[PDB]
Amino acid sequence: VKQHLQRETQLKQVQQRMDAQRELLKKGSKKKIVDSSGKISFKWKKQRKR
Amino acid sequence: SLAKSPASTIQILGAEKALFRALKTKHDTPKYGLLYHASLVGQATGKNKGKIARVLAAKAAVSLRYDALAEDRDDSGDIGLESRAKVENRLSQLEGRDLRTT
Amino acid sequence: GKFRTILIAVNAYGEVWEFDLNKNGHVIRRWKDQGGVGITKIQVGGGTTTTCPALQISKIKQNRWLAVGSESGFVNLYDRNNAMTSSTPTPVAALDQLTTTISNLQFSPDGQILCMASRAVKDALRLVHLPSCSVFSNWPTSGTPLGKVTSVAFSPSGGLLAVGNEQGKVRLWKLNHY
Amino acid sequence: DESDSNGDINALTKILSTTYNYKDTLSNSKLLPPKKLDIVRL
Amino acid sequence: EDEEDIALEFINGEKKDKLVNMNSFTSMFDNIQNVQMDTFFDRVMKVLT
Amino acid sequence: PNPKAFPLADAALTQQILDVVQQAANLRQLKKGANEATKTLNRGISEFIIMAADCEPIEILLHLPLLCEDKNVPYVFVPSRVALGRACGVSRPVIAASITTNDASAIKTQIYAVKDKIETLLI
Amino acid sequence: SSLSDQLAQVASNNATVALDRKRRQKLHSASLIYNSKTAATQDYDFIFENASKALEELSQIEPKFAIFSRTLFSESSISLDRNVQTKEEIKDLDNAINAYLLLASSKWYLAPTLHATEWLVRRFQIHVKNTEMLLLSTLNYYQTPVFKRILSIIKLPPLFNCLSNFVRSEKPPTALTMIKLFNDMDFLKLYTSYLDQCIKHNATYTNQLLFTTCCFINVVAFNSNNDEKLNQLVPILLEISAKLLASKSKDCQIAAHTILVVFATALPLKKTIILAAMETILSNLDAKEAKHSALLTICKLFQTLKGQGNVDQLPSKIFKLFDSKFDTVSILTFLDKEDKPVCDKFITSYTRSIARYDRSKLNIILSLLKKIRLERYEVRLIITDLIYLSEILEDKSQLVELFEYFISINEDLVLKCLKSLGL
């Protein structure tokens, strides 16, 4: 059971980061910020997609 | 249960086998499943059959649910009927869009 | 020689109060705009107002068109005659050609043209025909040196529309029908 | 053949035979047509 | 009162007209099969309105 | 106004919601529409659920609170679908929506405060 | 010019003279009902005997094929060739074909009709020599396998390149493509020629009229962008409107009603054009469905009419003719109908004409005012006209009641009018 659950969380992380990448691809007006501990993130300009 | 499920499922519900094979080997997903024999798709033609399968599936989810849970039912198929009007319209307009040049 | 001023205030959420001012400030009427979560600007037009200020108390008219411009880029246009008498009204039209944040709602003095303009990106202005409530479709094209519009000013009589953008320049256009 | 010499029926034919411009001009009816501005930059 | 005020009253009394746009007529090509042309006229009227 | 949705917020809590969802969608940590919320709930990633108490008919999202009860996730209604649409940032009425999970957001404190509020109401 | 160019020219000329056995097999093989192999085997006698039978059944169903049986289906018409008779005879025979096609355009849902036109198409080469009129007459039929077969057979004249790309497709052409077609202009000119001919022969019908009017509607639709193109498309559709008005078929007049309402709401027009239109519509108004439709159309015409003096008094003869066709009872009925289409400007011009002309049906006037809601400026205008009639005409209790109604409802504008003129 233990390795079930840990593999589960690992795959959750993989899927989350990979959907972050997809979103990166899709559309909009992105912005790349290096958050204080040194970690990248993306913020979209306030914009209603038509 | 059937209303419990979301739209994309009710689209794909038949050909779950090919779906899972595609998923576990990274080919491209099927599209029709059991709603093939629905008469709407039965007049659609090709890529149109796919698009109509999708829209009909969504409207099917709506109608399914409303018949399923509503405390107060008219049993007259009003939501389904107007839905059929909707998808009929979407169909014929899509059909009318021809892809070639004139 | 007798009139009255009605302040019309708008909290962001979408709740619109209407006070009068002749008697000390009381709440004449309160209603909820339909939708419009992030609401930022409000204007009235068509009669007389702080954008077409009249000349003598004989020249004061009662206003007809109400515009609620809201943050995602929307505009809801309202007809006073039935909004006031329904006290939980329905929009007469919705304009959402724009896509960015709304900053400037103004009217022509007549109330025939509703000039809306955003502020977050170049080329962000459009004019709307009333009472059709329909956006005009031959201006402004991609060769209109607008820039980030920040202030929208008609003139009362002449028929000019002066628009002022961020780069530090206003620009003129004259409407001919006026 | 031809010889030119209660409502009729040839009124439309005649009037369109006469007039050269149909989107009216003489009006300037103190109203503003939709979907078309008359705008001059300055 | 004054002439500009009459003109303002003219603008005010003007009421809106639902305009035509380039794709607001296909449903008749849809329902053109065996329906009465009076009904067709009704259809066009209510599509405008 | 609809006697079918049981938990329905006020103006104040509606304001709080629609704000949190603006910033969520502005980050794209929000998923939209009833079908997609249904997916997420079954995914077990749904942080919580907003619904719109003015969709005709109402059943077509009335089904979800079944899932919510089962999976122990908060769900609330707000009374204006056009509001929820222009809030989440699209061009249509949006009868439902759900906020997802990501601990790397700059909005964890807001999201838990709000879900505290909705829990308070629901319980 | 290129040698091959001039030779292609010559071929297009000579495409039918069955010069050789091969080209005879090809030409004679092109045909409608049968498949190619049989359409090559079978013979003139077979075709003609069956066709004559088909003419017999069709003359039974509709008795006016008889002269066609007289001429186009005679044993001589077995004998004769087309490609050697002189040009006078050719224009003659084409006129005859046009007559037949005009008539046969109405009954295409019948295998006997199919066989008759089959005889024509394989004996006279109508599928190459009278294609313009053939396609026009059959054009309202474009989901059916008959249109399939006919398109597939025929070389399409330059005005049909849309169908040209549709030649032997699998699915019928779509209204979108057909609307492109009609959006072209010279094709509209040809179509109007066709409809004038069809009207003057007075053989028109529901399917064709509905289709063609819907097509014009969508033409002004897709043209609604560039007001210039409409500024040059006005004539065509107006003359077709007038000529449809010329008919005696309530269907034709209400089709004209439709095309007028759409064109008038898509362009701002001139008052003279509008009033002339209303006049002729009324002048040929005969039926009662036409009455109702014309009422709606006239109302809309005035309501969309915009300019200086939108509420001017209706001219004299026009006003008398309108009263004659619609005494006040019809008007009050249409008004107190619950549909309530905006018709106030028409109402007001009507009232101004009544006051300036009739001076008697003032109680009808007040009833109408009590029945419909108006707007301030035209109310002022009507009041001013009433003031003129009070100051000129002898005082009338009905006029007093009119003033009283205004006093009950909006006396203050009456006061403003009095201060403009009077005590």
UniProtKB/Swiss-Prot annotation, chain A:
Q: Which portions of the sequence form the region Disordered?
A: 19-50
Q: Where in the cell is it found?
A: Nucleus, Nucleolus
- The regions listed as transmembrane in this protein's record are none
Q: What does this protein do?
A: Involved in nucleolar processing of pre-18S ribosomal RNA.
UniProt record similarity statement: Belongs to the UTP11 family.
Q: How does it assemble?
A: Component of the ribosomal small subunit (SSU) processome composed of at least 40 protein subunits and snoRNA U3. Interacts with snoRNA U3. Interacts with EBP2, FAF1, MPP10, RPS16A and RRP14.
Its name, as the record gives it, is U3 small nucleolar RNA-associated protein 11
Identify the species of origin: Saccharomyces cerevisiae (strain ATCC 204508 / S288c) (Baker's yeast)
Which section of the whole protein is represented? 201 to 250 of 250
Curated annotation (Swiss-Prot), chain E:
Signal sequence coordinates: none
* Coiled-coil stretches noted in the UniProt entry, renumbered to this chain: none
Q: Where in the cell is it found?
A: Nucleus, Nucleolus
Any remaining note in the record? Present with 6560 molecules/cell in log phase SD medium.
Oligomeric state and interaction partners are given as: Interacts with snoRNA U3. Interacts with MPP10. Component of the ribosomal small subunit (SSU) processome composed of at least 40 protein subunits and snoRNA U3. In the absence of snoRNA3, forms a complex with other t-UTPs. This complex can associate with pre-18S ribosomal RNAs.
Query: Which purpose does this protein serve, as stated in its record?
Result: Involved in nucleolar processing of pre-18S ribosomal RNA. Required for optimal pre-ribosomal RNA transcription by RNA polymerase I together with a subset of U3 proteins required for transcription (t-UTPs).
What name does this protein carry? NET1-associated nuclear protein 1
Which gene name belongs to this protein?
NAN1
Within the intact protein, the region shown is 848 to 896 of 896
Curated annotation (Swiss-Prot), chain F:
Q: Name one GO molecular function term.
A: RNA binding
Q: Which GO biological process categories is it annotated with?
A: box C/D sno(s)RNA 3'-end processing; maturation of SSU-rRNA; maturation of SSU-rRNA from tricistronic rRNA transcript (SSU-rRNA, 5.8S rRNA, LSU-rRNA); mRNA splicing, via spliceosome; snoRNA guided rRNA 2'-O-methylation; spliceosomal complex assembly
What InterPro entries does the annotation carry?
A: eL8/uL1-like, H/ACA_rnp_Nhp2-like, Ribosomal_eL30-like_sf, Ribosomal_eL8-like_CS, Ribosomal_eL8/eL30/eS12/Gad45, Ribosomal_eL8/Nhp2
| Gene Ontology cellular component annotations, sorted alphabetically | box C/D methylation guide snoRNP complex; nucleolus; nucleoplasm; nucleus; precatalytic spliceosome; small-subunit processome; spliceosomal complex; U4 snRNP
> What are the entry keywords?
mRNA processing, mRNA splicing, Nucleus, Ribonucleoprotein, Ribosome biogenesis, RNA-binding, rRNA processing, Spliceosome
Alphabetical list of CDD domains matching this protein: SNU13
Where found in the cell? Nucleus, Nucleolus
Q: Does the record's keyword annotation contain rRNA processing?
A: yes
The primary site where this protein sits is: nucleus
* Assembly with partners or alone: Binds to the C'/D and B/C motifs in U3 snoRNA. Component of the U4/U6-U5 tri-snRNP complex composed of the U4, U6 and U5 snRNAs and at least PRP3, PRP4, PRP6, PRP8, PRP18, PRP31, PRP38, SNU13, SNU23, SNU66, SNU114, SPP381, SMB1, SMD1, SMD2, SMD3, SMX2, SMX3, LSM2, LSM3, LSM4, LSM5, LSM6, LSM7, LSM8, BRR2 and DIB1. Binds to the 5'-stem-loop of U4 snRNA. Component of the ribosomal small subunit (SSU) processome composed of at least 40 protein subunits and snoRNA U3.
What family name appears in the similarity comment?
Belongs to the eukaryotic ribosomal protein eL8 family.
From Swiss-Prot, chain G:
A single BP term in Gene Ontology: maturation of SSU-rRNA
Domain of life where this protein originates: Eukaryota
What's in the keyword line of the UniProt record? Acetylation, Mitochondrion, Nucleus, Ribonucleoprotein, Ribosome biogenesis, rRNA processing, Transcription
- Please provide, alphabetically and separated by semicolons, the GO molecular function terms listed in this UniProt record: snoRNA binding; U3 snoRNA binding
The subcellular location is: Nucleus, Nucleolus; Mitochondrion
Additional comments on file?
A: Present with 18200 molecules/cell in log phase SD medium.
**Its quaternary structure?**
Interacts with snoRNA U3. Interacts with MPP10. Component of the ribosomal small subunit (SSU) processome composed of at least 40 protein subunits and snoRNA U3. In the absence of snoRNA3, forms a complex with other t-UTPs. This complex can associate with pre-18S ribosomal RNAs.
Q: What does this protein do?
A: Involved in nucleolar processing of pre-18S ribosomal RNA. Required for optimal pre-ribosomal RNA transcription by RNA polymerase I together with a subset of U3 proteins required for transcription (t-UTPs). Involved in ribosome biosynthesis.
Question: Protein name, please?
Answer: U3 small nucleolar RNA-associated protein 10
Species the sequence originates in: Saccharomyces cerevisiae (strain ATCC 204508 / S288c)
